[PDB]
Amino acid sequence: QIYYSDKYDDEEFEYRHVMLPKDIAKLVPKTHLMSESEWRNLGVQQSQGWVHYMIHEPEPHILLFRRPL
Amino acid sequence: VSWDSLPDELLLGIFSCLCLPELLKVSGVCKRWYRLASDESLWQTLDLTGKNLHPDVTGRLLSQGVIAFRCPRSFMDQPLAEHFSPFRVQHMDLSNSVIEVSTLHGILSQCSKLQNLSLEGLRLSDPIVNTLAKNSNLVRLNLSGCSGFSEFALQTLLSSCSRLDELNLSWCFDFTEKHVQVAVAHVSETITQLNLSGYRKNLQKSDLSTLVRRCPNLVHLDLSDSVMLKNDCFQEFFQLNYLQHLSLSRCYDIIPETLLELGEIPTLKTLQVFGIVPDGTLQLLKEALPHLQINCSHFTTIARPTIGNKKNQEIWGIKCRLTLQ
Amino acid sequence: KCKWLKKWIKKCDDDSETSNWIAANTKECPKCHVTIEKDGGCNHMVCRNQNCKAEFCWVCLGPWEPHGSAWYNCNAQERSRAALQRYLFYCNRYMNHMQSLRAAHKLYAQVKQKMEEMQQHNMSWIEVQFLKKAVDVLCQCRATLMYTYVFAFYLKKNNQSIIFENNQADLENATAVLSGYLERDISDSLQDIKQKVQDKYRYCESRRRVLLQHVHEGYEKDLWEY
Amino acid sequence: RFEVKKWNAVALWAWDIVVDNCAICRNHIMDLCIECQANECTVAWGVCNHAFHFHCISRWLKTRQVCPLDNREWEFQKYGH
Amino acid sequence: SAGSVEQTPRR
Amino acid sequence: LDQIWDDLRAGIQQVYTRQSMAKSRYMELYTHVYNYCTSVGLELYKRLKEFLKNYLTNLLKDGEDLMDESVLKFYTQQWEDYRFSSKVLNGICAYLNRHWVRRECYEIYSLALVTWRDCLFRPLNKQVTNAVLKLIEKERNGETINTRLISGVVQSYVELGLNEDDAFAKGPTLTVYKESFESQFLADTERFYTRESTEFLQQNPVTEYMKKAEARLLEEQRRVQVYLHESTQDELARKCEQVLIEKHLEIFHTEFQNLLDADKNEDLGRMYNLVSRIQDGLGELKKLLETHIHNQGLAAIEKCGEAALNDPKMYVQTVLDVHKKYNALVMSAFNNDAGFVAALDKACGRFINNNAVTKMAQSSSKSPELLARYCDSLLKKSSKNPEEAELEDTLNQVMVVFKYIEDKDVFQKFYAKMLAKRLVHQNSASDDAEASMISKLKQACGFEYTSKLQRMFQDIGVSKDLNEQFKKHLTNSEPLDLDFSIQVLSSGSWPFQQSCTFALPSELERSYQRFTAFYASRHSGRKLTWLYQLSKGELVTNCFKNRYTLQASTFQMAILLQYNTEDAYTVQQLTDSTQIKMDILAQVLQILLKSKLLVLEDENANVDEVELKPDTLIKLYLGYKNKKLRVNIN
Amino acid sequence: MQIFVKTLTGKTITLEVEPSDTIENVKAKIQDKEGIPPDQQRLIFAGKQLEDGRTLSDYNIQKESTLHLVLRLRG
Amino acid sequence: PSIKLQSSDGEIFEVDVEIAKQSVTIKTMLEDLGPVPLPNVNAAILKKVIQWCTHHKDDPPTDDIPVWDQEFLKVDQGTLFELILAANYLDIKGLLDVTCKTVANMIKGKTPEEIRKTFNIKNDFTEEEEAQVRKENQWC
Ligand SMILES: [Zn+2]
Ligand SMILES: [Zn+2]
Ligand SMILES: [Zn+2]
Ligand SMILES: [Zn+2]
Ligand SMILES: [Zn+2]
């Protein structure tokens, strides 16, 4: 299902890369990035500050958010 | 056999039918071909997304006459050291690209006629946005999710620009109710597409009342995940007899009943209320209001560079011509 | 007769029935005793005054202990509640007729435009003639139906008044259908609607004549017991 | 003498009752009721010398059971045909 | 007479 | 390069002044202008600009100041030559139009057009236009206009609509035309027509002025298609209409009055068309027409006077004739109007419901009475039998004059009474005609209006249904000696009173009781109030030597059935044995004594003025001889 | 020629009025005179609930015609 | 009808009028002024041009150019060059576009020195700014 991971983080901000199954992962566009409220509308849940900030091409349906302090 | 008589017009005609790598290869032939490889028509539209290249190179290749430059999610990681005339380009998108503020200001110092503009994700300063204030002709604006900008320079920017009809300003963490105060006080009230979602305890209903009383024409309104917009807010929404997009998803204090009053407005076309109305009774909402698309458009396209079909190399219908496959 | 009309119009907030609204849904606070109305259905309230720090539901009217615990759970109201319903019914329809009487001018303009439109739509001024007559008789029917209600208030019910109420109800229904016809269907059933409107307004006029005759009969043979 | 050869005459069919108002729909009894006036009244007779319509007394008798000029139970006495 | 908690969920 | 420019200028000078340019030279010229441009040719463009300016000024110096009829002959001819020459020139140097002039970030033919736009702005933009105006002021007479001049001038003015960097190559960009030709044209047209109209309306009658005005409007709308450009039609038509009419409206109204006083039904249509052309002007003709027709019809029935008060048919025919004539008129005046029809109807109502007949009768309800009695006299079973093909037509006519009336209550009452008498005495012309009458009356004024009459018909249907069945019941009852026939009415519809306190003498009692037992038992409860005051019969009176028979009502029947025993009774013996009131008794005895079958004390005294107390003997005249038997003594 | 409103402390107060005011403005007037929360208030006159939409003469409030006020405690 | 066209070197080739109404210049010849000498078109080049006009007489009027050019333009080098030049001269839009695309597809994938070899174009601006302009577009 919706597999989270540890708090692997950069120097200042904090990341936690997630994994989504087929149904909720087959609508992420190759075009641009989702707003935080946009993926909230799509129904994913996590803490406050998690903006969808990049896409990695080898894993198209596997998201990597960002969060401040 | 006599190449030495073929003119500039025919050679430019040949170069109009070539791809970027070979085109840059043949620029190294002689001085004549060097002039011909930059004629303010070959470089009309360009796309170089993803890259991390030289700021002086991108400055020159923007000076050579690009009207629509498409380059999101990219790097230019080095400061700028050469300044030229105010750039003629009119379609600039830096949505979620990564670049330092020094290079950002070095490039944005020459903004003249930026018709469509997007700088999602980057850090900006008050002089940067007040140099952006030079552009009083901007129409589509997307400055969502920036950092460092202040209210004073923000509102001076808004007063400077006058063609404000698209505005995507969601998830800028430094927005407050005073920020939306200066926003309504300084945007052109002709605005019809506005995004201020996610600011749960940053905005306030009274400022939305100001926005709707000065802007009775806005159609595409977005303030989702903002619990501090109480039920009287709906009344001010009831003021707007022109809205067709209305996103107030993730608002616990709202109810499926009171939002029915919004459907009392026939102009309301689609609604984005993911979360406030649980499963089961949203069908009752649809039955009681039969010309409303409740939670059928998961994203807004207000000044977004691209949307749909998952390939969409075009931007706002202005298809880019030169790229790297 | 004008004694009862003077009494009715002499209301000044009716001088009595406001107190019936007080006895309907107002109960004083156990801390700051004042006319207080619960709304909603929550049944869990705090007295939202500037000074009152005392919470209580509607139906305790006493200790705050039950709601939140299991202490007690709330262990001529109706006899005067129905009078409010009757008064609201009668004054409500009185006001409905007054309101739909004050808008006669717009009615005249609308029907004159409709008559001109029908006249240029292949018919003579006779159309304007009978729509003007229909409007006039409808206005007269409302102007007497109002006073039949104000009489139908101030009397003690006997065997005869049920008939009178039934007749008023039928006449009112007819008047409503006539106003509906008139404002609904200028658009091409002109002959059929001419038939319908003619029959309806003739019937309404005759029916009003019957009501006035009945009232004067009641005054004559002296049956009306107030 | 005889002089009785031919004769023709006219007679007025009328309901066999004192003054005829039906006291409910207030129309003439030989005339028609509420329903029979606004788009088949016969006369139903009471056991206390009163008689009304069909469309009128049927409704009033469905609602209550009194003779509506005299406090007393209602039962039919004679139909009309 | 606050919902849909947007906190980070379990593993 | 300049080793080519001289030869190329020679070629260009050759292509103007068209000496039939050869094709090989066209290749020489094109090859020159090509091989120069691929050596970036702004200097060639400037050479062409200065060459065109030079040639144009050198041509303009010739032929200036030729006040009229020559500036046209010069202008249009040089315009044709210059257009064709510059078109061929643009053909020669297309390469500039392909590559260089494409970089505009100035097209050769349009350059030539802008250069001639210089020769336009001269007094040539005043001499030519003023001469065009003075020549087109040959509208009146002199028709060798030779329209090829005006057509050329107008085509040149349109094509010289400016084009240089407006937005792009536009074409039909008529601004120069609109601001240098049309405005002066409209001003001069207005001047000419406001002269001619007030010149003509002092030596002529207006009845001819409408003819000439129609001809003028058609003439202008005709010339627009032959000289000028299309987009002048509406504006010129509006100006001509605003000048010829819309200023003489006072004269038009004061003429319409006297024209309607006579009966000229053709020129009225013409004045209609003229005043219809302008916006919202007709609204005085309406008032004049309705006042006229009102006075006309009122005087028309004033002709007949009091002699029509007692004759409905003449009254109704007069009124309906007035309406017929004026509806025939308004069948042509406003082309089946919605407003003149309204004026017609207002006047017809206002002189039907209040006019001389009801002026002298002091009763506004008099007129419906006469209409009803006319319908009566039309509907009776008369001798001069009206055929149906006229019958229903006349009925529709009566319904017209009806539907203009409003006091429908009095008409309902009178028609009810008269239909009652007509059906009781069985004197009806055609029952189906009555049914058609009542049906169209119903569709005219709804169901509630025509209830009582519908009853009046259906119940006589019931009586016709019941009489023969009672006779069938009578096959086994042997009715004593008489043919019995009854009519059983409803009591609410038919307007009659109760009775006159009769006695029903001996013979008729058996049939009376038998029939009332047949009826009151065949139906639940019904109280027949047998009235005899209107019930005819017949006597056989076989006390005579002649066997006479008399047609008489029940009153005479009882008075003579008294005579069954004796023949010399007195008044009071009859009065107590018949219970007749004094006035009815006086009338019936007067009618009896009008014939000599009954005799008083005298035999041939005053048989009309005698008023004798009941102490008076009534005697059968024994040896009675009569003119004939079978006498309606009524 | 005024309107009287029942203050919750008794003592029916008076205002100044035109016969075509707006009920929200009358709410503003009474809140001005007191400070009462101007959303939890119902006006009661002649036994019928005075709504917010129409005007005084619509519900027939003439001059020197009192009314009353009741709270709308939301719990 | 018919029309003959003189070559720049003497020869004359009878040509159908509707065949030679493709060249917009000759069409504007026969539009106004309705042995024409062409001075900047070699003889055999005119022969090839008129062959291509002939086979495309029934035209309706990269980028997937049709095959008959590939079995047409299979010809030596400078002949192709003068085909392009003549096509620009007579404004034969079809053959102009197809030869432009042919040159475009023949320039791809060659070193600049072989470009100036086949084009026989002399080399100035060299050994002084070579690596410099290489650095101006080093990213490729
Ligand atoms: Zn309290
Ligand atoms: Zn309780
Ligand atoms: Zn009845
Ligand atoms: Zn009935
Ligand atoms: Zn009884």
What spacing in Å lies between the alpha carbon of B90 and ligand 5's midpoint? 97
Secondary element (H or E) of residue F325: helix F312-330
Cα dihedral B278/B284/B290/B295 (nearest 10): 10
Do C and F count as touching (3 or more CB pairs closer than 8 A)? yes
The one-letter code for the residue type at C41 is: G
Q: At what angle do helices H77-90 and H43-55 cross, to 10 degrees?
A: 70
B255: containing domain: 1-325
Residues near F566 by beta carbon (within 8 Å), at least 6 away in sequence: none
* Partner residues linked to F414 by β-bridges: none
Q: What CATH code is carried by the domain that includes residue G53? A: 3.10.20.90
Burial class (CB in 10 A: 0-12, 13-18, 19+), F31: middle
Q: What is the number of CB-based contacts under 8 A between chain C and chain F? A: 24
Resolution (in Å) of the shown entry? 3.9
What spacing in Å lies between the alpha carbon of F518 and ligand 4's midpoint? 27
Q: What is the number of CB-based contacts under 8 A between chain A and chain B? A: 69
E8 in contact with chain C, both atoms CB, cutoff 8 A: no
Alpha-carbon distance of B146 to B123, in angstroms, equals: 5
Name the region of F136 (left: φ>0; alpha: ψ -120 to 50; beta: rest): alpha
Cross-chain Cβ contact C17/G47 below 8 Å = yes
Which own/partner contact pairs does C176-181 have at CB distance under 8 Å and 24+ positions apart? C178/C134, C178/C138, C178/C141, C178/C204, C179/C100, C179/C138
Of B271, B240, B239, B236, give the one whose Cα is nearest residue B256.
B271
Cβ-based neighbour number of residue B249 at 10 Å = 26
* Partner residues linked to F418 by β-bridges: none
For chain C, what's the residue count? 226
Take residue B303 and report the two structure tokens written for it. 């000044």
Burial class (CB in 10 A: 0-12, 13-18, 19+), A6: exposed
* Partner residues linked to B193 by β-bridges: B166, B220
D33 is in an annotated binding site: yes
Residue E10 phi/psi, 5-degree rounding, is -70, 170
Cross-chain Cβ contact G74/C48 below 8 Å = yes
What spacing in Å lies between the alpha carbon of C174 and ligand 4's midpoint? 17
Q: How many domains does chain B have?
A: 1
A30 in contact with chain B, both atoms CB, cutoff 8 A: yes
Specify whether the CB–CB gap between F477 and F514 falls below 8 A. yes
Do E and A count as touching (3 or more CB pairs closer than 8 A)? yes
The one-letter code for the residue type at E10 is: R
H helix intervals, B109-174: 126-132, 151-160
Of F497, F562, F560, give the one whose Cα is nearest residue F531.
F497
Of C184, C189, C70, C202, give the one whose Cα is nearest residue C130.
C202
D25 is in an annotated binding site: yes
CA distance A47 to chain E (A): 4
B275 in contact with chain E, both atoms CB, cutoff 8 A: yes
Which own/partner contact pairs does C62-66 have at CB distance under 8 Å and 24+ positions apart? C62/C30
Q: Provide residues of C within 8 Å CB-CB of chain D.
A: 159-160, 162-163, 167, 170, 174, 203, 210, 213-214
Measured between beta carbons, which residues in chain D are less than 8 angstroms from residue F509?
none
Cβ-based neighbour number of residue C211 at 10 Å = 19
How far CA C123 is from CA of C108, F337, F404, in Å, comes to 20, 10, 14
Beta strands in F375-423 (DSSP E): none
Alpha-carbon distance of F541 to D5, in angstroms, equals: 9
Name the region of B94 (left: φ>0; alpha: ψ -120 to 50; beta: rest): alpha
The residue ranges of every structural domain in chain A are 1-69
Q: How many domains does chain G have?
A: 1
Q: Which of F38, F40, F99 sits opposite B5 (nearest CB)?
A: F38
Cα dihedral F329/F331/F332/F334 (nearest 10): 110
C141 a catalytic residue? no
Alpha-carbon distance of C89 to C96, in angstroms, equals: 10
The one-letter code for the residue type at D73 is: E
The residue ranges of every structural domain in chain D are 1-81
**Which 3-state string (H, E, C) describes chain A?**
CCECCCCCCCCCCECCECECCHHHHCCCCCCCCCCHHHHHHHCCCCCCCCEEEECCCCCCCCCEEEECC
Using CB atoms, list chains with 3+ pairs below 8 Å to chain C: D, E, F, G
Burial class (CB in 10 A: 0-12, 13-18, 19+), C109: exposed
Of F582, F151, B1, G64, give the one whose Cα is nearest residue C12.
G64
D81 is in an annotated binding site: no
* Partner residues linked to B5 by β-bridges: none
Alpha-carbon distance of H69 to H95, in angstroms, equals: 9
B72 in contact with chain A, both atoms CB, cutoff 8 A: yes
Interface probe, candidates C112, C115, C119, C125, chain F, greatest F C-beta count within 10 A: C125
Alpha-carbon distance of E5 to F279, in angstroms, equals: 72
Q: Which of B17, B53, B60 sits opposite H139 (nearest CB)?
A: B53
Measured between beta carbons, which residues in chain C are less than 8 angstroms from residue F443?
195
Residue F383 phi/psi, 5-degree rounding, is -85, -45
**CATH number for the domain whose boundaries are C84-221:** 1.20.120.1750
For chain F, what's the residue count? 634
For chain G, what's the residue count? 75
* Partner residues linked to B91 by β-bridges: B68, B116
F441: containing domain: 367-460
Alpha-carbon distance of F558 to F578, in angstroms, equals: 7
Q: Provide residues of A within 8 Å CB-CB of chain E.
A: 4, 16, 40, 45-48, 50
Residue C89 phi/psi, 5-degree rounding, is -55, -50
Secondary element (H or E) of residue C221: helix C190-221
Coil, helix or strand for B225? coil
Using CB atoms, list chains with 3+ pairs below 8 Å to chain G: C
Coil, helix or strand for F566? coil
The one-letter code for the residue type at H24 is: V
How far CA F260 is from CA of F293, F301, F341, in Å, comes to 9, 19, 16
The one-letter code for the residue type at B268 is: L
CA distance B304 to chain E (A): 26
Cβ-based neighbour number of residue C184 at 10 Å = 9
Residues near B140 by beta carbon (within 8 Å), at least 6 away in sequence: B115, B116, B117, B118, B165, B166, B303, B316
Of G35, C82, C45, give the one whose Cα is nearest residue C36.
C45
Q: What is the number of CB-based contacts under 8 A between chain F and chain H? A: 31
The one-letter code for the residue type at F205 is: P
- Scan for tokens 């100041």, then name that residue: F65
Cross-chain Cβ contact F482/D10 below 8 Å = no
Q: Among all residues of chain F, which has the CA nearest to that of H85?
A: F38
Specify whether the CB–CB gap between F568 and F617 falls below 8 A. yes
Q: DSSP string of B159-217? A: HH-----EEE--S-TT--HHHHHHHHHHS-TT--EEE-TT-TTT--HHHHHHHHHH-TT
Q: DSSP string of F470-496? A: HHHHGGGT--SS-EEEEEEEETTTS--
Alpha-carbon distance of B325 to C23, in angstroms, equals: 82
Residue D8 phi/psi, 5-degree rounding, is -140, 145
C57 is in an annotated binding site: yes
Burial profile D2-15: b = 16 or more Cβ within 10 angstroms, e = fewer: ebbebbbbbbbbbb
Alpha-carbon distance of F460 to F421, in angstroms, equals: 13
Q: Where is chain F discontinuous (C–N over 2.5 Å), named by the preceding residue? A: 39, 105
Name the region of H33 (left: φ>0; alpha: ψ -120 to 50; beta: rest): left
Residues near H51 by beta carbon (within 8 Å), at least 6 away in sequence: none
Measured between beta carbons, which residues in chain B are less than 8 angstroms from residue F99?
9
D76 in contact with chain F, both atoms CB, cutoff 8 A: no
H helix intervals, B225-302: 231-239, 260-263, 282-288
Alpha-carbon distance of B159 to F327, in angstroms, equals: 73
Q: Are strands G68-71 and H12-15 parallel, antiparallel or unpaired?
A: unpaired
G34: containing domain: 2-71
Specify whether the CB–CB gap between B268 and B219 falls below 8 A. no
Alpha-carbon distance of F626 to C183, in angstroms, equals: 75
HSE at residue F312, side-chain half, CA atoms within 13 A, is 15
Alpha-carbon distance of C36 to C58, in angstroms, equals: 9
Using CB atoms, list chains with 3+ pairs below 8 Å to chain E: A, B, C
What spacing in Å lies between the alpha carbon of C30 and ligand 2's midpoint? 12
CA distance B117 to chain H (A): 27
Cross-chain Cβ contact D13/F540 below 8 Å = no
